[PDB]
Design a protein around this ligand. Sequence first.
Ligand code: HEM
Ligand SMILES: [Zn+2]
Ligand SMILES: [Zn+2]
Ligand SMILES: [Zn+2]
Ligand SMILES: [Zn+2]
Ligand SMILES: [Zn+2]
Ligand SMILES: [Zn+2]
Ligand SMILES: [Zn+2]
Length: 174
Amino acid sequence: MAFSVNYDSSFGGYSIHDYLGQWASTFGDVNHTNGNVTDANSGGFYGGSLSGSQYAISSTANQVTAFVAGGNLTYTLFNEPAATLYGQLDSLSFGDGLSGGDTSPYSIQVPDVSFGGLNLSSLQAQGHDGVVHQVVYGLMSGDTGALETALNGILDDYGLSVNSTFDQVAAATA
Ligand code: HEM
Ligand SMILES: [Zn+2]
Ligand SMILES: [Zn+2]
Ligand SMILES: [Zn+2]
Ligand SMILES: [Zn+2]
Ligand SMILES: [Zn+2]
Ligand SMILES: [Zn+2]
Ligand SMILES: [Zn+2]
């Protein structure tokens, strides 16, 4: 599992960039900035108040659209590097309807699209500009830039990019 995709068949013909743009447009922007944080726009880990096996959040614009990152995600709320998600990211899953996350895993009710085998490490020395911090925080802000750049990294070894279809990426993994 040095990479894999799964997807609702409706997206076979979407480029990765096109699905992510659709996803970001309706997810919106959680607005995780100063003066504006809440219970509502923070997310949560599965397996701890602050560290865990997956981090997940729902859109505060439509209550529904969501993602879940999953690998080995420690955080540092007030710790040495102030407010910076570090660790290990293996998977991103996008879609509608986040449930669970307490004594069960975070699970998406209506999955769209899912990447596994990302192999992306940032250690807590690298702060609020590590890499998993930049991806995840990016996603929390409706900004897929950081995820699309990393994906092109993974995908260009297969002679593809995020501007190729899901069916196409599927073919190149087997
Ligand atoms: C792992 C996912 C998380 C990421 C990537 C993240 C990242 C950030 C970033 C980049 C800021 C910068 C604020 C700014 O400059 O405007 C921030 C603020 C903040 N975050 Fe997080 N955070 C995460 C999880 C959490 C969690 C679980 C909490 C707990 C409720 C939390 C509480 C806060 C607080 C209290 C602030 C500053 C509030 C203020 O000064 O007004 N964060 N976060
Ligand atoms: Zn469908
Ligand atoms: Zn914003
Ligand atoms: Zn959707
Ligand atoms: Zn939808
Ligand atoms: Zn959908
Ligand atoms: Zn950007
Ligand atoms: Zn490469």
